Amino acid sequence: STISFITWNIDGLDGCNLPERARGVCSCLALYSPDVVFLQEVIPPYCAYLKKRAASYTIITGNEEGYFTAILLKKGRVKFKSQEIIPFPNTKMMRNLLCVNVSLGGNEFCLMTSHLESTREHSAERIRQLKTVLGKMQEAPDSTTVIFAGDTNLRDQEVIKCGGLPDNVFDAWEFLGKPKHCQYTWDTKANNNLRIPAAYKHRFDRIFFRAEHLIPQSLDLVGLEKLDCGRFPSDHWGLLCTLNVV
Ligand SMILES: [Mg+2]
């Protein structure tokens, strides 16, 4: 059998055109109908809007106030077993690690998302949070399939500069041979929501997994069509991933 998910920083902190952009995100989600959606930078009204328009999804949130992550579970496809929010004690931006244990098909999944500390100057904290995420990924049972997907904010060769990922933790994009068609998920040349004239791009949005039994089949960008307001759903592109379970 196969599983599919979308991971997406939908940029709820940009208050312009936000309902329209929410509608955009939801149309996008409706097109692909992923089993799971990992969202970052959600805000309460956006979350309510999701509860309304993304009605086929069960919404779990990493917080109730400010801005936060969310995991949407396709009703009828994904059965919720439990959730757990691991704190990042030294976050200055309310960041944490949202874990949702679910059953999908006949397989146990630990679904994880976070929006790691932002900006360059908070590299250290971001790395420590990444280490927390990885450790939590290691913690899970061997029977469970562990999938992290989120906005890592990783940049400046931080990962390889820090020794690279552990041996049993795989990057989906790397596993698929680093395709360039979906390498960059944040792109100020292609995306204009931030209205930055200079061309910057990063692979902020990443998918980590641990399993024995899990083979990434595909990786694609989403949210690449402009809306009526002449802007994209978010300053980030979404990442659609499909994986086989064996
Ligand atoms: Mg944002």
UniProtKB/Swiss-Prot annotation:
UniProt subcellular location: Nucleus; Nucleus, PML body; Nucleus, Nucleolus; Cytoplasm
Keywords from the named record: Acetylation, Cytoplasm, DNA damage, DNA repair, Hydrolase, Isopeptide bond, Magnesium, Metal-binding, Nuclease, Nucleus, Phosphoprotein, Ubl conjugation
Keyword Hydrolase: yes
Keyword DNA damage: yes
GO molecular function list: 5'-tyrosyl-DNA phosphodiesterase activity; endonuclease activity; magnesium ion binding; manganese ion binding; phosphoric diester hydrolase activity; single-stranded DNA binding; tyrosyl-RNA phosphodiesterase activity
Catalytic residues identified in the record: 151 (proton donor/acceptor)
Positions annotated to bind Mg(2+): 11, 41
Distribution of this protein across tissues and organs: Widely expressed. Expressed in whole brain, cerebellum, quiescent cortical astrocytes and cerebellar granule neurons.
Domain of life of the organism encoding this protein: Eukaryota
Cofactor: Mg(2+); Mn(2+)
Cofactor comment text: Binds 1 magnesium or manganese ion per subunit.
Enzyme Commission number, as recorded: 3.1.4.-
Biological processes, Gene Ontology terms: double-strand break repair; neuron development
Marked site (Interaction with 5' end of substrate DNA) residue numbers: 67, 186, 204, 236
EC class name: hydrolase
Subunit structure: Interacts with TRAF2, TRAF3, TRAF5, TRAF6, TNFRSF8/CD30, TNFRSF5/CD40, TNFRSF1B/TNF-R75, ETS1, ETS2, FLI1, SMAD3 and ACVR1B/ALK4.
Family per record: Belongs to the CCR4/nocturin family.
Function: DNA repair enzyme that can remove a variety of covalent adducts from DNA through hydrolysis of a 5'-phosphodiester bond, giving rise to DNA with a free 5' phosphate. Catalyzes the hydrolysis of dead-end complexes between DNA and the topoisomerase 2 (TOP2) active site tyrosine residue. The 5'-tyrosyl DNA phosphodiesterase activity can enable the repair of TOP2-induced DNA double-strand breaks/DSBs without the need for nuclease activity, creating a 'clean' DSB with 5'-phosphate termini that are ready for ligation.
Miscellaneous section: Can partially complement the absence of Tdp1 due to its weak 3'-tyrosyl DNA phosphodiesterase activity.
Protein name listed in UniProt: Tyrosyl-DNA phosphodiesterase 2
Covered residues, full protein: 122 to 369 of 370
